[PDB]
Curated annotation (Swiss-Prot), chains A, B, C:
The lineage of its organism: Viruses, Duplodnaviria, Heunggongvirae, Uroviricota, Caudoviricetes. The chain holds residues 118 to 280 of 280 of the full protein. This is Capsid fiber protein. Belongs to the phi29likevirus major capsid fiber protein family. It is found in: Virion. Protein that forms the 55 capsid fibers. These fibers are not always present and may have been lost in some lab strains. They may enhance the attachment of the virions onto the host cell wall. GO terms for biological process: symbiont entry into host cell; virion attachment to host cell.
Length: 164, 164, 164
């Protein structure tokens, strides 16, 4: 004979809807209630569907922000920590390393600090200024020879080559 | 009585296929047309299925390249920007920092530039060369004393300790 | 007339279960056997479901560790390589750059090494120590003038300003 779907007395509501349906798309529309999941199964997702599916797939919020390609400075700090273990390198990646990080980063690459040349002292190597010009001596008496020696001494004193 | 599936006159084509099906796998084969989605639901995905599902799940192409573990230099630039906000650090991560980035990176870690010791001038602290040997004086007349003074002067001039 | 589901003689086992089912949730429970996939479709995933879905979606183990927000040092090395192409920068990100990496990292940012001021030599610019104090000369004879010259010479010798 011929019966119809509604003649089947113990069929369920969804069961009768499925029996009447003609295509797979129609069946998916009955079976899948979550609109984001339905969109994935249909291979047709909006950016909103994608974000919502990412919420169903991943627990970590910093990972989720990365996957959305939109990260805050806090998300970036956490993501840096997933990528790099060295604390001083993490300081560098923040753009704001601590004093300790800075020292350790220089050590890490063998870099020095800005060097400033200190003046010579009696205990410590240093720079000097060059002494003023001094004429060779043509002295024929003691008085003049002493005058010329003293001119050299003052020049060396003036340039901080010898102490006062 | 006994009826068969095709006796149900208002059943749909997919509906009759489902009513005849014996297992859940058979039902999934009817209902899910997208082969990548079907593969996910079956828990059996090839690398191609995985790439195609990633295309359905994520909009950002640089994120997608990261998830495929294959990034171009352009993808890497964009991913760096998702991970780090400091412009000078981004310059470092590129391997090709600008002049401004280089200055700022040194500031950031308190590093100096390569130092070259300049010669002393009359205005500016600097290095000198060490003067040649000079004998102590045993002069008993003015002529010799002057000779010995002049020997010291020339030595200091030769080493650039005093000006010509 | 009235028939029941079990009167349909060529219905399949899953087909009869679906025909009896009343709701979409009930239909999903019949059709989807993989518990992680069912959880995604129901929009209700535990952390275990999420990890298991990530296993179905991504092939690369280092990417998977990143997505779980739990990376080993080995995972971090591999993820760094997906993010940065410059070998010397990768050395920095490891926290343990090689000697070659260190040289190249300094070059990259225009940094110098720690500078140590060398003593002056007869060939090479260097620092000096400042000479001890020397009194101006009040000599009225050759013997004293020579004494004063020699005092200057010794002071300059003592400070390594001139050679012995």
């Amino acid at each position: 004979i011929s019966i119809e779907v509604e003649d089947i007395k113990d069929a369920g509501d969804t069961g009768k809807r499925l029996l009447k349906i003609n295509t797979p798309s129609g069946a998916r529309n009955i079976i899948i209630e979550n609109e984001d999941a339905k969109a994935l199964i249909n291979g047709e997702t909006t950016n909103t569907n994608k974000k919502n599916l990412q919420d169903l797939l991943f627990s970590d919020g910093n990972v989720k922000a990365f996957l959305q390609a939109t990260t805050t400075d806090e998300n970036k700090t956490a993501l840096q920590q997933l990528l790099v273990s060295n604390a001083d390198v993490l300081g560098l990646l923040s753009g704001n390393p601590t004093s300790d990080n800075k020292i350790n980063l220089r050590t890490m690459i063998g870099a020095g600090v800005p060097y400033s040349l200190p003046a010579a002292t009696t205990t410590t190597l240093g720079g000097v200024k060059k002494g003023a010009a001094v004429t060779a001596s043509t002295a024929t008496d003691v008085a003049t020879a002493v005058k010329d020696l003293n001119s050299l001494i003052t020049v060396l004193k003036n340039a901080g080559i010898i102490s006062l």
